[PDB]
């Protein structure tokens, strides 16, 4: 059976907060297609020969 990820429990209460003391700078990569290859078809030359 497939796994949906690691289980976690946020320690929530009505007077407690969490504040970061340090950070990190991430660089991610996102790849997007823009334009496929242009094609043309000669219909007479395809369907019939000479």
């Amino acid at each position: 059976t497939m796994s949906l990820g690691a289980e976690n429990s946020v320690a929530y209460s009505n007077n407690s907060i969490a504040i970061p003391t340090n950070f990190t700078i991430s660089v991610t990569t996102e790849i997007l297609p823009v334009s496929m290859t242009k094609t043309s078809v000669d219909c007479t030359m395809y369907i019939c020969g000479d």
Partner: protein
Amino acid sequence: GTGVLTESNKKFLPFQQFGRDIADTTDAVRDPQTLEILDITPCSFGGVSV
């Protein structure tokens, strides 16, 4: 057919007569009079734009 008959370096087996392409068209022929192998190439053609 119609095309250009060029001298070929195809190695036909002695029982073979024709050599076919991917589209099951005749790509190579065996000359019946003298035992030589020829390749068939379609003549020059291309798109025209105005």
